[PDB]
Amino acid sequence: VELYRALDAYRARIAVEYVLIRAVRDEIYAVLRRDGGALPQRFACHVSR
Amino acid sequence: VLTQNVLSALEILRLVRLDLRQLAQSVQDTIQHMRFLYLL
């Protein structure tokens, strides 16, 4: 049981960057749902219709 | 000239049976160890 808990703590250790990545991914999808897919321009680039 | 030898070997074969029981317990213990830990 001690090795099991130590393995779980290790799992929580290495997961720290991936949970942040998923936080950003879910944030992108949540903002995209909230806005309705309307993206405003925030970076300069001449665009064509 | 033989029965004494076969019983004097049985005197160690009892320990052999003990070691068989010990090894079987070890094998079951290892299987339980692996099954508990490594199968998420």
Describe the structure in your own words.
This is part of a larger assembly, with chains A (49 residues) and B (40 residues). Chain A is mostly helical. Helix content of chain A is 67%, strand content 0%. Chain A has helices at 2-14, 16-35. Chain A is elongated, with a radius of gyration of 20 Å. By secondary structure, chain B is mainly α. Chain B has one helix at 3-38. The longest helix of chain B is centred in the middle third of the chain and has 36 residues, at 3-38. The chains hardly touch. It is classed as virus. Keywords: tegument, portal, DNA packaging, intracellular transport, virus.
Key words describing this protein structure:
part of a larger assembly; 2 chains; A: 49 residues; mainly alpha; 2 helices; elongated; B: 40 residues; 90% helix; rod-shaped; virus; tegument
Strand content of chain B: under 5%
Class from helix and strand fractions of chain B:
mainly alpha
Main beta sheet of chain B, described?
none
Q: What shape does the CA trace of chain A take?
A: elongated
The beta-strand count of chain A equals 0
Oligomeric state: part of a larger assembly
How far apart are the termini of chain A? 63 Å
Q: Roughly what percent helix of chain B?
A: over 70%
Calculate Rg of chain B over CA atoms. 17 Å
Instruction: Determine the N-to-C terminus distance of chain B.
Output: 61 Å
